[PDB]
Amino acid sequence: DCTGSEPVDAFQAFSEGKEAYVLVRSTDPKARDCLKGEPAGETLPVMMTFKNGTDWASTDWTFTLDGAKVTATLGNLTQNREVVYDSQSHHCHVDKVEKEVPDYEMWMLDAGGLEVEVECCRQKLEELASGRNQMYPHLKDC
Ligand SMILES: CCCCC/C=C\C[C@@H](O)/C=C/C=C/C=C\[C@@H](O)CCCC(=O)O
């Protein structure tokens, strides 16, 4: 059984903005290597850390949450997401990145993820991605 948290709430899916999450699956071929989103004080400020290519980089995004929907902004760049699946204990979740041809991402806790729940997120990402190639950004010499 892989029934997640219902109704899906983005604030609950991110452990109420108290835990760091890592990008582990993505249908976007330009997905950031070793991407990790973590709390950056206090809308909801988020610090994104990633690699491009050998050197580490970091940017400050501002999240605006409303139910399952998540709007992230950096300067004048805007990205819209919807948390389409969240596991029982908020250990992982799957986002639909809203654009002309939507992408799907799997995010999981940087530390303390329950295997059965993480596997349910992997299956939900497989279902939504279907045959589209799934990048594993956390396996890029992180
Ligand atoms: C209070 C801490 C919150 C941590 C939660 C992190 C990710 C959740 C996940 O569902 C949402 C991800 C949103 C990503 C938004 C933008 C990224 O594409 C930016 C990548 C880095 C960049 O290119 O600058």
Numbering used by the authors: 23 to 64, 69 to 168
The authors write:
OmCI is a bifunctional protein derived from blood-feeding ticks that specifically prevents complement (C)-mediated C5 activation and also sequesters leukotriene B4 (LTB4) within an internal binding pocket. The 17-kDa lipocalin Ornithodoros moubata complement inhibitor OmCI, originally isolated from an ectoparasitic tick (Acari), is a bifunctional protein that may have such therapeutic advantages. By binding directly to C5 in the vicinity of the C5-C345C domain OmCI prevents cleavage of C5 by the C5 complement convertases, thereby preventing release of anaphylatoxin C5a and formation of the terminal 5b-9 C complex (TCC). We describe two crystal structures of bacterially expressed OmCI: one binding a C16 fatty acid and the other binding LTB4 (C20).
The ligands are also of different lengths (C16, C18, and C20, respectively, for palmitoleic acid, ricinoleic acid, and LTB4); LTB4 fills the pocket completely, whereas the yOmCI-ricinoleic acid and bOmCI-palmitoleic acid complexes show a water molecule filling the bottom of the pocket. Hydroxylation at this position is common to ricinoleic acid and LTB4, and both complexes show the -OH group on C12 forming hydrogen bonds to His-119 and Asp-121. Gln-105 recognizes the -OH at LTB4 C5. The C9=C10 double bond present in LTB4, but not in palmitoleic or ricinoleic acid, stacks against the guanidinium head of Arg-107. The same Arg side chain is the source of the selectivity against cyclic eicosanoids such as TXB2 and TXA2 (43), as it makes the pocket too narrow to accommodate cyclic ligands. The hydrophobic side chains of Phe-36, Tyr-43, Leu-57, Gly-59, Pro-61, Leu-70, Val-72, Met-74, Phe-76, Trp-87, Phe-89, Arg-107, and Trp-133 contact the hydrophobic body of all three ligands. The three ligands all bind with their carboxylic acid head at the solvent-exposed brim of the OmCI pocket, hydrogen bonding to the side chains of Arg-54, Thr-85, and Trp-87. The other main locus of structural variability in the bOmCI and yOmCI structures is the conformation of the βH-α3 loop (amino acids 132–142), shown previously to be required for C5 inhibition, which in both complexes of bOmCI swings inward, with the concomitant flip of the side chain of His-117. Dispersion interactions between the conjugated leukotriene and nearby amino acids cause the shift, which is consistent with the triene chromophore of LTB4 being completely encompassed by OmCI.
